[PDB]
Design a protein around this ligand. Structure first.
Ligand SMILES: Nc1ncccc1-c1cc(Cc2ccc(COc3ccccn3)cc2)no1
Length: 468
């Protein structure tokens, strides 16, 4: 585990995604780049999106800051050059238009960057050029490979918020059993893949990873099982908002963990004799994952809309606020917000709460147990990133297509993820990784990235979408 590393290094390493996005937008608006599409656009996109992240993670991990400047300062200059070679929105349209869901570019960029980072890190973990401080921690610590799950849960909750809103828009309430069947149909593929991976592990008899998730439990099972519990709870969430339920669950879990020490002693040093004693880690982390999913849904609630609505800060509503504005009170005026102000409010509240909790916590963070500080840290980081991406989108003024690679990876995330896993397995069976000198490993990584990018672009261009 090597105890991991500090958070500030993690933020400095990850900011490269946002820096590259800003540089790409500047290059697009610089007007020098020729109008028709050609090899130049593809080369520039590949260099900006894939090569920069790989350079940040492995070779230039020691000095990230300098790298960022070398990405931003040149492009900006080119921008100005365009501005020297060269010597609408309607309120009535908003009033007349009803409530519909609208896709946003920054969400696509966010998901594409997340998926690319993961795909790179999965293969990069084996080679020696990858720094050892970024490896996953054993019991207590912070590392770059602990934020991958939290981010995924947050994004899935944000996405499911749109299904919630669309269901609410319908005039007839669907039956509860129909909702359960829809959840089962959604989770069937993940459950089937989990069982297949379990059987493949039986056949492999590979190395033990018991402390990670237990004898039988796995990430796919939890991902498939979350929605069923959410639909079971939704009846209660009708009477009180989701945020209060998440707070209550987290408080109960933390009190149970902290009131005494025998619970920790049993959770850490117990024998594996019966089934419950065999898979304790996954069962106990399920509560934290549920809390993260709930907060992600609540955050996406007002983000995924197209126009401001009444009390969209914590509740799904489709009505209009201007009619209320004739005699709007203080509460109705404060709570009904546009996406940016709501993001800012939640960000500040979570920052202050996280600072207090980190100040007065006796233990450290832990991924195995998914205690309170871990969830707080994940939520605060994700909120900050999302606010940055929204601010960039707003200042650049584009509203109402992001780079090609981001859209291509976003379209077929699951299939490309499985293909990436298969390719990493094959390349590991190909050669001995720990032997390779740095240049050879870098060349191998470059070839693998090129192959994946070519496959993704070819799949997207022919308009073929595969769902597994
Ligand atoms: N190894 C894994 N296994 C299973 C699951 C996941 C992972 C995993 C993937 C990563 C790469 C990574 C993704 C997301 C983020 C934070 O989110 C954003 C959003 C926008 C821009 C930049 N980052 C950091 C780092 N690290 O770990």
């Amino acid at each position: 585990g090597l105890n991991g590393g500090s958070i500030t290094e993690i933020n400095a390493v990850t900011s490269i995604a946002l820096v590259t996005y800003i540089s790409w937008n500047l290059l697009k608006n610089s007007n020098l780049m020729p109008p028709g599409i050609s090899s130049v656009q593809y080369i520039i996109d590949f260099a900006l999106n894939w090569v920069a992240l790989l350079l940040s993670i492995t070779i230039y991990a020691s000095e990230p800051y300098l790298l960022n400047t070398l990405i931003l300062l040149p492009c900006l200059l080119a921008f100005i050059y365009g501005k020297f070679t060269s010597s609408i929105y309607n309120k009535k349209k908003m009033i007349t238009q009803r409530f519909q869901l609208e896709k946003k570019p920054y969400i696509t960029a966010y998901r594409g960057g997340m998926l690319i980072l993961t795909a790179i890190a999965i293969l990069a973990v084996d080679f020696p050029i990858f720094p050892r401080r970024f490896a996953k921690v054993e019991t207590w610590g912070t590392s770059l490979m602990d934020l991958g799950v939290g981010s995924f849960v947050f994004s899935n909750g944000i996405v499911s918020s749109r299904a919630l809103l669309k269901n609410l828009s319908l005039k007839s309430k669907p039956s509860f059993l129909k909702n359960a069947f829809n959840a089962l149909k959604s989770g069937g593929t993940l459950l089937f893949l989990g069982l297949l991976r379990l059987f493949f592990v039986k056949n492999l008899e590979y190395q033990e990873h018991v402390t990670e998730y237990g004898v039988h439990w796995n990430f796919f099972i939890t991902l498939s099982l979350l929605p069923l519990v959410l639909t079971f709870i939704d009846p209660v969430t009708r009477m009180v908002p989701r945020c209060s339920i998440a707070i209550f669950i987290s408080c109960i879990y933390e009190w149970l963990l902290l009131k005494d020490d025998r619970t920790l002693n049993f959770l850490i040093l117990a024998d594996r004799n019966c089934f419950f004693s065999a898979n304790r880690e996954g069962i106990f982390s399920f509560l934290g994952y549920c809390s993260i999913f709930l907060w992600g849904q609540n955050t996406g609630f007002y983000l995924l809309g197209n126009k401001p609505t009444l009390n969209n800060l914590y509740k799904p509503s489709t009505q209009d606020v201007v009619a209320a504005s004739k005699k709007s009170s203080t509460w109705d005026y404060w709570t009904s917000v546009t996406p940016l102000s709501g993001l800012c409010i939640w960000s500040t509240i979570f920052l202050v709460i996280s600072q207090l909790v980190f100040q007065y916590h006796p233990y450290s963070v832990s991924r195995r147990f998914a205690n309170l500080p871990y969830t707080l840290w994940v939520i605060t980081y994700n909120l900050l990133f999302l606010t940055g991406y929204c601010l960039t989108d707003k200042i650049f003024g584009n509203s109402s297509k992001v780079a090609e690679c981001l859209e291509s990876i976003n379209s077929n995330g699951l299939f490309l993820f499985l293909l990436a896993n298969v390719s990493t397995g094959l390349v590991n069976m190909s050669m001995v990784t720990i032997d390779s000198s740095p240049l050879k490993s870098f060349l191998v990584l470059l070839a693998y990235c090129s192959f994946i990018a070519v496959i993704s672009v070819f799949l997207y261009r022919k308009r073929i979408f595969i769902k597994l």
